[PDB]
Structures are given as structure tokens and as C-alpha cells.
RNA sequence: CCUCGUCAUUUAAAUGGUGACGCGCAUGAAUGGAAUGACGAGAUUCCCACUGUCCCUACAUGUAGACUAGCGAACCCAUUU
RNA sequence: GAGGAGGAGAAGGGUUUCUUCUCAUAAGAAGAGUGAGCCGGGUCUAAGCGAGUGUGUAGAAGCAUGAGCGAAGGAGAAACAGGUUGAUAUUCCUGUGCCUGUGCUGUCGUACGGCAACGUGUAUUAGCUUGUCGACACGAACAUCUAGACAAAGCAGAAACACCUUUUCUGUUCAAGGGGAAAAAGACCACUGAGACGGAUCAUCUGGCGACGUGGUUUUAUAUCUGUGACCAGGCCUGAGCCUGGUUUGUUGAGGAUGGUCGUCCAUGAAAAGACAACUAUAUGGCAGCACAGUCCGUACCAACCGUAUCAGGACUCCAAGGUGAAGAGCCUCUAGUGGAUGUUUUACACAUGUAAGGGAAUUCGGCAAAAUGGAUGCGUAACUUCGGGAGAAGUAUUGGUUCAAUUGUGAACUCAUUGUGACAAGGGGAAUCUGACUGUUUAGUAAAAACAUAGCUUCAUGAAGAGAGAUGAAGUGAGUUCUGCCCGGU
RNA sequence: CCUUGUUGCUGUGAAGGCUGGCGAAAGCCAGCUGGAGGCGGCAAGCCGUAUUGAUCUGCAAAUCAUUGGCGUAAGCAGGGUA
């Protein structure tokens, strides 16, 4: 079985130095570089990952279409559907108590 | 001879580092506030947990650190200064709190930010209010009684993390982790096991001190080792304390 | 469970360290690992994150507590005194 | 601020003053180019890849070399690569926008 | 090795041009009295201290 | 110290080992005293197995060594021995 | 012998690399050789250092604040195949691309859908504020993918043939970019309304703060296709060009990658540059073609490094085939790489090793050295103990080849001239005493210990803090069990 | 002190869990599941007990052979800083 050399950079096996083995049209087995995985947004209240948005690294994320980075609601990314339902209710119910305390 | 271990470890390059610190711990300065508890966190060198608070100063949001009392939670609203209610975790002027109550983080003079009771499991007791002089007597966890003016502030509860000294550290590595952030030498080599160039207890054909271990308060610094200015020694019973409020 | 007569959770240590010391450690070690009841949601899902900080695995609430138990003896008493002050 | 500058790539440092009289033509096309190189190594590059090779002044850069060629010899340039050699000479390689013209310019200039 | 600074490279370039014998025509000149160039070096016998 | 202390056991035979005894030249209590478990490349005595350690030495193998080509030093030295 | 005497990088060296000539040879002389927007430096900040200014000094040192600096292995926009030289190549040549900006010409835009979970639409600058990304310990088990390795069939070429053999060997390829599933694992939305009870994992567990069920919404790989043909094998001719193949299935599987769980801690495991969303104003903005731009420095070679040298020493990392076996152990082979002071059968004494009648420690300060035991399976296991251990205690038996049953428990028969963990690999065991509790540490170069450390125990001083008595420092004894008597005359 | 790299094969089988039996209770006994430990035998490595072996004009101003101790961790190591 054919064995590999490091084509570029350092041999020292840090997080930035992941590699995989690949077979070429010329029938050689060579190392090729790998980019790191990305984490997408977590909710600002509960720590849950937001639905409807992609996971990518900051530079690659910025080059995608805007639709990959939001949902069409009051808080776009930012917060999940349950947390917005709570926020909408809370603001309403507080105003009604103040209404009563003003009228009485 | 040469300089002893006790002096070398007091030089500046040996002082504790602050790079992992969260901030300076202490009360806000304002006459009244409403605060929210944002997070409860561990800080690398300290066994009692800290609470991050958020309060408005002018229009702007500002952040502070308190030591956590037991029974707060993330999201709780707390009331600071004059006109706060007697509820667990509020901060109040000392003259408002009834006798026999338990308090933490007491200011020694107004607006100092809180000193006194700050270690896990500790509290102070309010023992007397004097309506003429506007003084209050507090009993500290050493047993000492001290007088503070009624305008000083204090936190209502016991400091979190009590009970920690119940579980013995059975192994050498467990002690290692505890002393890694402190200033004391660990492991500690005994002075009688050194040569006379290194320590006043060194040398001789048997391991012994050879001279009395009780030393004067006014002795020169590079030989002030042993029991410094001891009033008595040994395992026998002492005498009655004298007490005034 | 409970395959040993006396040694309990301290069986991990074999014949090392003293007998008397192990039976003090045991009290704390059994207390640390248990799940406890949540005040906010009623479920038995509370566990320790770090000394002094306790946390619920369902609803996410964090609360200050003791080193090896969520509520200490001094707290159970003092909490009552405050409720009387409010009267 | 003063520092030993041992890791730096540019050996100059100081900003330069004005002067009462200034040198006539300045750093200019006929200071930039030294000579074209014609040997068995260079000949292949003219015949196969439409590129000439030249020695250039140490103070020169890619933009300056591009201008100077279009001024002295007259053909239009696609690319310039540069190489500092072990013998203390900066070499430049110039590829022309049309091949074939390389053999015309080389022969007129007497390089080949 | 392959990685070098600009300052180290110029030291090597200069150390390499100086390392040459007396040219063979000079020996014929009436006034010339040198036998061998005593400043010649070998990589096996001395260090440059370019570091 | 006297000292290879006296009595018992282990051997054919014990300046050794273990068990007893005690006016202990000069034992002894966090200058820490006493009785055990688990763990020591720690110090010491005995038994079983095992053997060229020994009685008592013999034969055989590889590599150097002797002789031969090429290459080729040093310590030391009043020297007549 | 793939934890290589193989193929490559870093630190260190500096032309030792390639061609020609000459011996002068680990020797010289003369030439030639290192090409980048996408690889690394120049950027950000760690622990930390610091010009100037203030205070101080005869001048200094020191102390307060602080521009600038601080990682070729931490963070950090964008490239891959195939060819070419005597010597360079993700840098040159051909092909297909991508990032950041600039300009021309066309062509469209100023909004909607779903009960909802959310979708359709490549969208401008600017600003508050709130949040996210960058951005993170160790250990264990379980899934899924990819390299790799096997076995059948097909074809092409090889090896072997006194005999036998469809026996044996080598091949059967597909990059970045573009398009794209089923699957598995989790979140969530609508209807529904469940218990002394249902659901679910290898393991924990889970439900009126909404179970099972029936329909959906979304996040995370990979296979497959295109990449316009290159590349490989074979045949025919040849100082050149033609022709034919590159087809199918099963088993296994990382020392690489990823996912959601679980455990541990008086230990809770970096920052910043640079980004993004929501909200508010404001709008000539999106896409396709064509064109232009992207500076400066490093790039050869190492078996050539440090030890006065062509020195059995020292010296940071990466990739890794088949058999035997639990096993990148030892032993044997494939790919790739390798070697000289000459002849002589060569006494004695040596240094590395073999074997030995009868006896079995008589040897010696002393069993020092050697021998003996050895893997797996079963039977059987004492005193004492802190009840965990002692414990593989001790003591005993079995083991190869073949042909069968039975399906993980294993049985049975036949066979051999010394018997079978056959080579290689692979514990000697028991009874007592002194001593230190244990794992750990030490006199680099004559001492590894009973010495040091350690957990635990006791005493002392303080309300001063960027620290606040469950704290901060100073001493002594040495885990646990059981005890710790008397004396304040001297110092 | 800051930033990093480096755990392969096997034995024993704590806490927690599920079944079956015994008991008036409290809680006892089997078999299985689970995988803790400055815990055992080894590999790569790190070290330095014995032969008072070889060498002592050395291969070497501290090396070599066999034999040993630890090896899931108060373990070993590169660079930056004090
Ligand atoms: Zn949320
Ligand atoms: Zn809860």
C-alpha cells in the first residue's frame, strides 16, 4: 500500500491541520486538506440551536444568500418560536395590569 | 547563610495572578436600584460562586459582581439601597434589619462596597442597635464584636458553598489541586530536615530544633520562624472571654 | 446494586487510605451523585455543575446551594425566620 | 520606537527629505533594465512559452519592470515573475500578450 | 533550512562570493608576492555564525 | 559496656535465627509509645524444588589472539643492569 | 521486515545539489541552477516586555501610568488534476475554477404564500441597542461514513511443468469546482387525550409544563452524475504512428472523520482582530456577458545537525501490507532500500555461548551467577484483616493431527518411535522477624535507602486586604486503630 | 505562568439498574447488565537494581550487553515568558 507525505505546512497534527486520503485520476493516493466544521446560532434565552438556518464558518456564511441566515419573523435568527410567543404575551399582560392600576 | 523560603515567596513575581479574574467584587454606589441577576459563575481561585448583576445608571446598562448567597436563581429581580424590602437576597441599610438576624458582605463604612463576611458558609449576627449614637454591634465569625454606623449596607442571607470541609482529601493529588492557586509552599519541606545555611532549625546529628521555638515580635525578619509572639503553648484549656457590645 | 456489606461507594479505593477516613468521605460522595427535586417544575432532575451551583436538566434553571447538597441545614432553618419577618 | 528589526523583509526604514536640487531623470526605464540573457536555458523559453528573461536593478519591482519593457522594446506584456538568485542578481521573466513576437524582439535586440 | 529571513540570506550570498582562490593571471605580475589566499574556508572546518 | 548474658527450640555440631526473662553501662510516650493488614529492585534466618557454586574437571562452537599482505602510534627514559 | 537500515517536513548547517575535466580525491577547478492574488512571513491578541511622561537619584537602580512590541505548530478571504528539466514546481505549461475590488454593455426589481412548525425570492449604505459566530478539560461505551484488506466470476500479460495443477502472480483509475438522494440521529408544529401504567436504551431513563398514534417543518454526512478527457496495461510496426481493453458481485474494516448520550472534580478547562442577525432611517439595486488589477521577502540539497572527526552517544514530528498470536510483541515474507585492512584450519590464556556419570550448596561473607517455573481451560484454595483484600494463595489435571456430531456450551472416535503454550514468546513457591502505611521523589559521573514528600492530627499570629476567619500566613508530628503520665526550678 | 503535542492489547469487576426466590415486616440470597481505580500483567516509551560482567592507549571526558523498576497518570515532551 502506497504511503503519503505532507505536501504543505507543518506535520504537527493541530486542529488547523486535518487531512484526508484521496485517489486521483492518475492512480495515486495522496493527502488533501480539510476545513474545520461550523456551528450555527443558539437562542439568546434557552440555549437551543435555531431552526431554519445553516451551519458554516464565519467567512463562508457571509457569502451565502440572506435566506440561509434568518427566518421571516419578529426576531430573525436571534430567538426561537417558543421564546417569542412568551415575549409577545408578557408585554401584553403587563400593559393590562398597568391599565387597571391606572383606571382603579 | 542565605535567604529563607518565607522571604523569597513574598517578592513581587510570586504574587497571585489576576488573568482569569471576572472583575472587582462589590456593591453599586447609587442610592436606589433595581437589578436583575444575569448569571451565576465559578471563578478560578475562589470556592464561593459569584453572581453577575445588571442595573441602569442614567440610560445605560451597567454590570456588577456580588458574592452569591444561597437561594438566588438566574433571572431573579433584586432591590438595592434605601426602601428595599426584607426579602432574601436584597441589600438594605443595617439599621432597618431586626436584632438576631443573619447578614453577609457588610460595609465597614458607607459606600466601601462590602467587606467582612465573604467565605463559604459564613454569616454575621446583629447583636444591638443604639438609638442615640446610631451605632450597631455585629458579631463576626471569629467571635469578635465590632461597631458599625447605621448607614452601612448589608446583604440578607448566608454565603453559598457551605459544608466543603467535611470530605477529607485522601490523596496527594487532591491536595495539589487545592493549593495550586494559593501562595503557601506545597509540598512543604520541614526546617529540621534542612542544613544550617537554609533555615534556623537545620543541622546536627539528630533531627531536633535545639533552641526554643517561641520567638519575639520584634525579632529580625530572616530568622522570625516558629511560633511568633505566642501567649501560651500546648493542648490545655484556656480562659473566659470578656464581652461588651 | 449493593454488592458490598459496608464499603459502599468507597470500594473504588481498595485497601488504601484509612477505614475511618473513607466512612467520612462516603457521606458526601453518596450525596453528590443523587438527583433532587426541582422547585420550579416538580421533576427529580436537579444535579450539581460545580461546588455551590445546582442545575435542572429539564427547565434549565440554576440555583445557589451547598457543596454536597442543594439546601444546607442552616438554610432550611433561616428560610423560616424570614417568612415570619414578613408577617 | 526602536527595535532591532531582524525579522523584517525591507532593509530600508527612514523617510526621505526633499532637496534643493533634484537628480535629472530619477529612477527611470534605462536604470531599471540591465541586459537580456541568451543561452541554451533561455532559448527554450523563447521557443516554447513566449517569454524573455532579464537582469534588473535591485531597487525594481513588478510594476516598474512592466512599464520599462513597454517603453524600451515596445511589445505588450501579460505577466512578470521575479527571482532573487544565490549570486546576488535579481532575474525577471516577462511573458508577451502574443507569442511569436518573442523571437522578433529577441533577434532585433541581439539577445539571441 | 528552507525558511530564511532577508538578513540571513544576504550574509550567505556575500560569504559565497568571497570564497575563491587567487586568479591565475595575477601570479605573472612583476610586483605580486602572495602565494595562496588565506581567507578561503570550508564548510567542514569552520562556522559562519549567520545562525 | 560487662557479653559469645542465662533458659528453651532449630543442627551431627549454632560468636547465627526465633520464643521467654529483666535494677534497662545509657528503653519510654506528637524530641511521639505500643499491636496488626495491604504494598517494597529495602535489611535478616529457615524449608521445598532446582542446579558445574562445589567434589573434579572434560569435550565442542563463534570472535579475537599466533603466522602473512597493505597502513602505522603512545606512555616512559642519569643508564653501564 | 511498514514503532524500517523506506519515503517526507522543523530546528541546526550553507552550496555540501547538477554537468564537465583532473587526481590532488570525504581533493580541487571552471561553469549552471531556487519563478506564487489562492503555500508560509508581513495581521490579531496570551502570559509578559516597554519609549516618553510623573516621582526619585550626585548620576543610577526602583516605583506609578502607558504609545509601541509579543506565536513560520493558537485565531486568521480564496486551487485542484495531468504534463515538462541535468538540476524547480499545488510557483512554469495545458485544462477547468475561486476570492477581493474596478469599469462598460444588455436585462429585470420596488413583493407574496402556509392554522403553524416555516417557505419563495442571489439585494443599498448608515447608525444606536440586544444577542450570536470566532471560542476551546479529561475518560468510557454505542452508531454511521471513508481509507485499507480479503474471496468469487470475466478478460489481458507474466511465472512454473522428469511428473502434477483452469496451481500461482500483476492490473481493472476518476481531483478541486458544480449538481444531489434515500438513511440514521436529534429538535419542533397541528389534531388527539393516556396510569398503581404505557413508551424506550448496550447503559442511564421518559409522560397532563401533554404518552402512544396519524400527517408535516427543519439541521447535520455520504453514495451517485457532470468535470468536455487525461492516465494505465497489452498487441502491431518502428529511427511513426495505429489498434484493443479498463467488466460484475459478496465479506470485513481505521492507529482517520462525525453524531447524540453517560461519568469525574474543595480542579469547571484563553483573548482579540474580523464577521452576522433583529430593530430604525434611507434607497437606481440584483443578474448575465466582456475587460482590468492584486506590491515586498522565503522557495536548491541533507544519511551533510551537536559532541576537536567520516564518533555504537544525544536530538521536535507525519504515512504505514500479508501469515502466526489477545496483541503497530518476537519470529518469517512482498513494496522500497542496502555492505569491505588479505590470505592462512588457525597452540596456550581469554571474551560471548552449549552439554555432562554419581552426589546435590559440601562452595562462598552471602545460592553471587546459572538452572528450574511459565500461555489458555477446569477442579480446588489457609492464617490474618481497616471486611475492600490476602488470591494467579498453595496444591492438581488437560492441550498435536485427522474425520465426525452439536451450534457456542462443546462433545465423541480414529492415529503417531521418545509427544503436542513442540521453534519464538512465556510467574519459582511457602514459613517468620526488623523497618517505612500506600503510588510518588533524590546525591547528572562510586550511596535509590529505613532518607524527603504525602493524606491525617496539634499548636501559633491576626478584622489588615485586588484576599476577608469553611480566610491568610508561620512551625512540629507523620495514613488508619489504641493511648499520649509527672515537672514552670534554669532558658 | 501562557500556547500545544502524546493512551495500543489484556485481567480484576466498585456505584447504579433488571429478573427470580425467601420473609408479617425491615431486608436477605442467586443469575445477568454496567464499567470505577495516583488498581494488576505487557507494548511504544521513560528510568537506572544486579552481574561489583565487557570497556578502562575506550565507539564514548559516563558508553555497551543481559537482567531489572514504572507504564489510564502528585506521567513524559517542543516553542513563548519569568
Ligand atoms: Zn429559546
Ligand atoms: Zn426544572
mmCIF file of N, CA, C and O (backbone and C1' of nucleotides) in Angstrom, chain A residues 14-18 34-39 56-57, chain G residues 74-76 134-135 258:
data_model
loop_
_atom_site.group_PDB
_atom_site.id
_atom_site.type_symbol
_atom_site.label_atom_id
_atom_site.label_comp_id
_atom_site.label_asym_id
_atom_site.label_seq_id
_atom_site.Cartn_x
_atom_site.Cartn_y
_atom_site.Cartn_z
ATOM 1 N N UNK A 14 -2.279 19.651 14.717
ATOM 2 C CA UNK A 14 -3.156 20.566 15.432
ATOM 3 C C UNK A 14 -4.520 20.621 14.743
ATOM 4 O O UNK A 14 -4.668 20.084 13.652
ATOM 5 N N UNK A 15 -5.496 21.331 15.345
ATOM 6 C CA UNK A 15 -6.876 21.437 14.871
ATOM 7 C C UNK A 15 -6.967 22.001 13.452
ATOM 8 O O UNK A 15 -7.873 21.650 12.703
ATOM 9 N N UNK A 16 -6.039 22.890 13.099
ATOM 10 C CA UNK A 16 -5.999 23.504 11.783
ATOM 11 C C UNK A 16 -5.316 22.626 10.734
ATOM 12 O O UNK A 16 -5.114 23.078 9.611
ATOM 13 N N UNK A 17 -4.946 21.390 11.069
ATOM 14 C CA UNK A 17 -4.143 20.577 10.170
ATOM 15 C C UNK A 17 -4.812 19.235 9.871
ATOM 16 O O UNK A 17 -4.108 18.257 9.633
ATOM 17 N N UNK A 18 -6.153 19.166 9.864
ATOM 18 C CA UNK A 18 -6.833 17.937 9.481
ATOM 19 C C UNK A 18 -6.547 17.631 8.009
ATOM 20 O O UNK A 18 -6.397 18.549 7.205
ATOM 21 N N UNK A 34 -8.481 19.587 4.738
ATOM 22 C CA UNK A 34 -9.860 19.626 5.214
ATOM 23 C C UNK A 34 -10.057 20.900 6.036
ATOM 24 O O UNK A 34 -9.251 21.194 6.920
ATOM 25 N N UNK A 35 -11.147 21.631 5.766
ATOM 26 C CA UNK A 35 -11.525 22.798 6.553
ATOM 27 C C UNK A 35 -12.343 22.382 7.774
ATOM 28 O O UNK A 35 -13.017 21.353 7.759
ATOM 29 N N UNK A 36 -12.312 23.212 8.817
ATOM 30 C CA UNK A 36 -12.979 22.921 10.075
ATOM 31 C C UNK A 36 -14.500 22.998 9.940
ATOM 32 O O UNK A 36 -15.007 23.706 9.075
ATOM 33 N N UNK A 37 -15.227 22.287 10.819
ATOM 34 C CA UNK A 37 -16.685 22.363 10.859
ATOM 35 C C UNK A 37 -17.157 23.679 11.482
ATOM 36 O O UNK A 37 -16.407 24.336 12.207
ATOM 37 N N UNK A 38 -18.403 24.056 11.163
ATOM 38 C CA UNK A 38 -19.045 25.259 11.675
ATOM 39 C C UNK A 38 -20.216 24.950 12.608
ATOM 40 O O UNK A 38 -20.899 23.943 12.435
ATOM 41 N N UNK A 39 -20.400 25.825 13.608
ATOM 42 C CA UNK A 39 -21.556 25.845 14.493
ATOM 43 C C UNK A 39 -22.428 27.044 14.136
ATOM 44 O O UNK A 39 -21.922 28.155 13.976
ATOM 45 N N UNK A 56 -22.128 27.048 9.247
ATOM 46 C CA UNK A 56 -20.944 27.280 8.439
ATOM 47 C C UNK A 56 -19.971 28.137 9.237
ATOM 48 O O UNK A 56 -20.341 28.698 10.264
ATOM 49 N N UNK A 57 -18.736 28.246 8.748
ATOM 50 C CA UNK A 57 -17.727 29.099 9.363
ATOM 51 C C UNK A 57 -17.932 30.554 8.935
ATOM 52 O O UNK A 57 -18.492 30.804 7.873
ATOM 53 P P G G 74 -1.131 26.553 14.912
ATOM 54 O "O5'" G G 74 -1.620 27.060 16.365
ATOM 55 C "C5'" G G 74 -2.484 26.233 17.232
ATOM 56 C "C4'" G G 74 -3.398 27.113 18.065
ATOM 57 C "C3'" G G 74 -4.336 28.039 17.287
ATOM 58 O "O3'" G G 74 -5.453 27.235 16.887
ATOM 59 C "C1'" G G 74 -3.218 29.289 18.999
ATOM 60 P P A G 75 -6.298 27.714 15.610
ATOM 61 O "O5'" A G 75 -7.077 28.940 16.291
ATOM 62 C "C5'" A G 75 -8.395 29.313 15.850
ATOM 63 C "C4'" A G 75 -8.548 30.816 15.824
ATOM 64 C "C3'" A G 75 -8.597 31.390 14.414
ATOM 65 O "O3'" A G 75 -9.900 31.241 13.879
ATOM 66 C "C1'" A G 75 -7.220 32.721 15.750
ATOM 67 P P G G 76 -9.975 30.539 12.440
ATOM 68 O "O5'" G G 76 -9.380 31.631 11.422
ATOM 69 C "C5'" G G 76 -9.948 32.976 11.307
ATOM 70 C "C4'" G G 76 -8.928 33.877 10.644
ATOM 71 C "C3'" G G 76 -8.489 33.491 9.222
ATOM 72 O "O3'" G G 76 -9.358 33.993 8.199
ATOM 73 C "C1'" G G 76 -6.583 34.057 10.538
ATOM 74 P P G G 134 -18.074 29.113 16.828
ATOM 75 O "O5'" G G 134 -16.825 30.093 16.538
ATOM 76 C "C5'" G G 134 -16.068 30.025 15.277
ATOM 77 C "C4'" G G 134 -15.036 31.138 15.236
ATOM 78 C "C3'" G G 134 -13.904 31.123 16.277
ATOM 79 O "O3'" G G 134 -12.843 30.234 15.914
ATOM 80 C "C1'" G G 134 -14.791 33.330 16.067
ATOM 81 P P A G 135 -12.178 29.298 17.040
ATOM 82 O "O5'" A G 135 -13.419 28.794 17.935
ATOM 83 C "C5'" A G 135 -13.196 27.850 19.029
ATOM 84 C "C4'" A G 135 -13.977 28.264 20.260
ATOM 85 C "C3'" A G 135 -15.482 28.526 20.071
ATOM 86 O "O3'" A G 135 -16.236 27.938 21.143
ATOM 87 C "C1'" A G 135 -14.484 30.383 21.118
ATOM 88 P P U G 258 -14.082 15.679 13.142
ATOM 89 O "O5'" U G 258 -15.618 15.202 13.168
ATOM 90 C "C5'" U G 258 -16.562 15.757 12.219
ATOM 91 C "C4'" U G 258 -17.817 14.917 12.213
ATOM 92 C "C3'" U G 258 -18.656 14.942 13.489
ATOM 93 O "O3'" U G 258 -19.459 16.123 13.569
ATOM 94 C "C1'" U G 258 -18.524 12.719 12.619
#
